[PDB]
Amino acid sequence: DRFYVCPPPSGSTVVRLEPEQACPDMLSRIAAAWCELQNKDRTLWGEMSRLNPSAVATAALGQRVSARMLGDVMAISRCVEVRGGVYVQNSMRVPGERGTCYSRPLVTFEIEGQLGDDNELLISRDLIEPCTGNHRRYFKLGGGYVYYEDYSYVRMVEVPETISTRVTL
Amino acid sequence: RFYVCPPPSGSTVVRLEPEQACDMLSRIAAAWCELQNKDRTLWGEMSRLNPSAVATAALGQRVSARMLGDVMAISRCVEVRGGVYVQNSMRVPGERGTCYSRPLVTFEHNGTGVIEGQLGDDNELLISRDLIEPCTGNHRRYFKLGGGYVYYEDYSYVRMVEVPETISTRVTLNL
Amino acid sequence: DRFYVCPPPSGSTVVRLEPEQACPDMLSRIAAAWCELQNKDRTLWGEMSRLNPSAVATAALGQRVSARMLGDVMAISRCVEVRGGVYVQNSMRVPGERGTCYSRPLVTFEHNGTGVIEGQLGDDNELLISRDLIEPCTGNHRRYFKLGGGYVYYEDYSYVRMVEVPETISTRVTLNL
């Protein structure tokens, strides 16, 4: 899948989450339940907007967007594809400090940033954690995954095993 | 509307209904069942951070709630009757650096008298004024207030606004 | 329901949450929206999998598993039934320091792999071998923990009685056909 950078949301585009919607023979009990379902779910969507507004808004608009909460309202900025080659960097240790490492891999792309959630590329290399033993991480990188051990790069891996929360109809 | 939330007591205690035992309208019915079983886990996880919002959704009436271990304490929320005064400055008078996360309000009714509290989520008026955060530059906020929203640049009131711009995760089913 | 121990997931089995799928007159309008609904829904599961991957995994599989993140992927390990009896401690007060307390009850139970484990009641009837879920103490302290098919009641950090909570609240949407 594609790489995006996410431009900071300005206080310009301000939107909110579509409120609960009023609700209206076996094609009719289904329609009302479907409505009541959608309404109730909005409470879950509400809670997520608080913490992960970006991901609530991408799902809502069907496009890659960045978001921040400015209180009780959302500030939307469109994301941009990175056509280039992206390159991951061997170490994940911070060259100026010991006992601190980047929590996610460093990359360079066409600038010196680091890998975010779901193939987002950041410019800010500032996701850091205290270092650990048995440090093992798999990071989604484009179509595949890249594996790290003791914060030193190891290999690109496939992860075929899959778990699902879909309901089959 | 507006609401005050009394603190729930250990009087009536409830819990989330557990997962349930489960031609085309039959498979659909089955999927519908399973979907409810699966969503159940989403509701459970939220009920720990925000039991209130879980309860009110499940109840149909604005309620408040707290977790007592794995069980939930409830109280109905009182509907606010009367005018409201929104303060203009969200800076705490007591200290520099620290301010209010949401706008202060004064309103009044029921037992017993005028309350100096603050604006909560989803048009809940709080009594406790403790929603505190250190000051930041270029600090824009909006806060839901009744139907519309109240704008706030660098920690003080500007104007009343609106938001025609609606974003939906809702899914449509036109039968 | 039944009790469960949960071995720590080594990265031996590592999984990912299955991606969204491309979506295909009145019956069609449904399966379409049903598919768009699962698609949308996946963002919620993506989120939860970040705080409680164990619960995301057990819902997915239909069995009690315990998970932990290793980056953007889930280490899975299948949980095992505990079958012997169980001793519940009366006092959720921690022995070492005043003011510090367990936030879930202490249990002792016996396993088949290892022997007697001095553990602790956890969510949805899981038994943990650790005894380190620790909050500070409080007055006015009332808790109800899920234990077997009932709930056990504690006041001021010490056992009281075996309650039942008949009272139920629900987010379910009924559909009758």
The full 3-state SS of chain C, as one line of letters, equals: CCCEECCCCCCCCEEEECCCCCCCCCCHHHHHHHHHHHHHHHHHHHHHHHHCHHHHHHHHHCCCEEEEECECCEEEEECEECCCCEEECCECECCCCCCEEECCCEEEEECCCCCEEEEEECHHHEEECCCCCEEECCCCCEEEEEECCEEEEEECCEEEEEECCCCEECCCCCCCC
Q: Are residues C2 and C85 located together in one domain of the fold?
A: no
Q: Are residues B111 and B153 located together in one domain of the fold?
A: yes
Q: Within chain B, what is the greatest distance between any pair of CA atoms?
A: 69
Angle of the A26-51 helix axis to the A53-61 helix axis, nearest 10: 140
Q: Are residues A154 and A114 located together in one domain of the fold?
A: yes
Judged by CB atoms closer than 8 Å, whether chains meet at B140 and A44 is answered as no
Measured distance CA(C7)–CA(B128) in Å, rounded: 44
For residue B94, the one-letter residue type is: G
Chains interfacing with A (3 or more CB pairs < 8 Å):
B, C
Judged by CB atoms closer than 8 Å, whether chains meet at C144 and B57 is answered as no
Judged by CB atoms closer than 8 Å, whether chains meet at B175 and A30 is answered as yes
Judged by CB atoms closer than 8 Å, whether chains meet at C173 and A136 is answered as no
Q: Are residues B120 and B71 located together in one domain of the fold?
A: no
To probe the interface with A, which of C13, C44, C78 has the most A CB atoms within 10 Å? C44
Q: Are residues C91 and C61 located together in one domain of the fold?
A: no
Judged by CB atoms closer than 8 Å, whether chains meet at B13 and C144 is answered as yes
Structure token digits, residue B3: 């609401």
Q: Are residues C69 and C86 located together in one domain of the fold?
A: no
Q: Facing residues of C148 across strands?
A: none
Residues followed by a break in chain B (C to N exceeding 2.5 Å) are 22
Q: Are residues C115 and C133 located together in one domain of the fold?
A: yes
Measured distance CA(C72)–CA(C139) in Å, rounded: 41
Measured distance CA(A164)–CA(A151) in Å, rounded: 29
Final residue belonging to a domain, choices A79, A98, A128: A79
Residue appearing with tokens 């989330």? B16
Q: Are residues B60 and B110 located together in one domain of the fold?
A: no
Q: Respond yes or no on whether the N-terminal peptide bond of residue B169 is cis (omega within 30° of 0).
A: no
Judged by CB atoms closer than 8 Å, whether chains meet at C173 and A137 is answered as no
Q: Are residues A117 and A167 located together in one domain of the fold?
A: yes
How many angstroms separate the first and last alpha carbons of chain A?
A: 27
Q: Which CATH number do you get for residue B104?
A: 2.30.30.1230
Angle of the A26-51 helix axis to the B24-49 helix axis, nearest 10: 30
DSSP category for residue B91 = B
Resolution (A): 2.7
Which of chain A's residues have a Cβ under 8 Å away from the Cβ of C56? 163, 165
| Residue A60 Cα, gap to closest chain B Cα (Å) | 4
Interface of A with B in 94-133 (CB under 8 A): none
Decide if B20 touches C, using CB distance below 8 A.
yes
To probe the interface with C, which of B9, B38, B63, B71 has the most C CB atoms within 10 Å? B71
Measured distance CA(B46)–CA(A163) in Å, rounded: 22
- Answer yes or no: are the C-beta atoms of C6 and C128 closer than 8 Å: yes
Judged by CB atoms closer than 8 Å, whether chains meet at C144 and B12 is answered as no
Experiment used for this model: X-ray
How many angstroms separate the first and last alpha carbons of chain C?
A: 30
Q: Are residues B56 and B132 located together in one domain of the fold?
A: no
- Residue span of the structural domain in which B156 resides: 78-175
Q: Are residues B91 and B153 located together in one domain of the fold?
A: yes
Angle of the C28-51 helix axis to the A26-51 helix axis, nearest 10: 30
Decide if C165 touches B, using CB distance below 8 A.
yes
Number of domains in chain C: 2
| Residue A91 Cα, gap to closest chain B Cα (Å) | 34
Q: Count CB-CB contacts under 10 A for residue A169.
A: 17
Judged by CB atoms closer than 8 Å, whether chains meet at C17 and A163 is answered as yes
Measured distance CA(C148)–CA(C164) in Å, rounded: 11
Structure token digits, residue A159: 């992860």
Q: Are residues A32 and A87 located together in one domain of the fold?
A: no
Final residue belonging to a domain, choices B61, B77, B93: B77
Final residue belonging to a domain, choices B40, B56, B77: B77
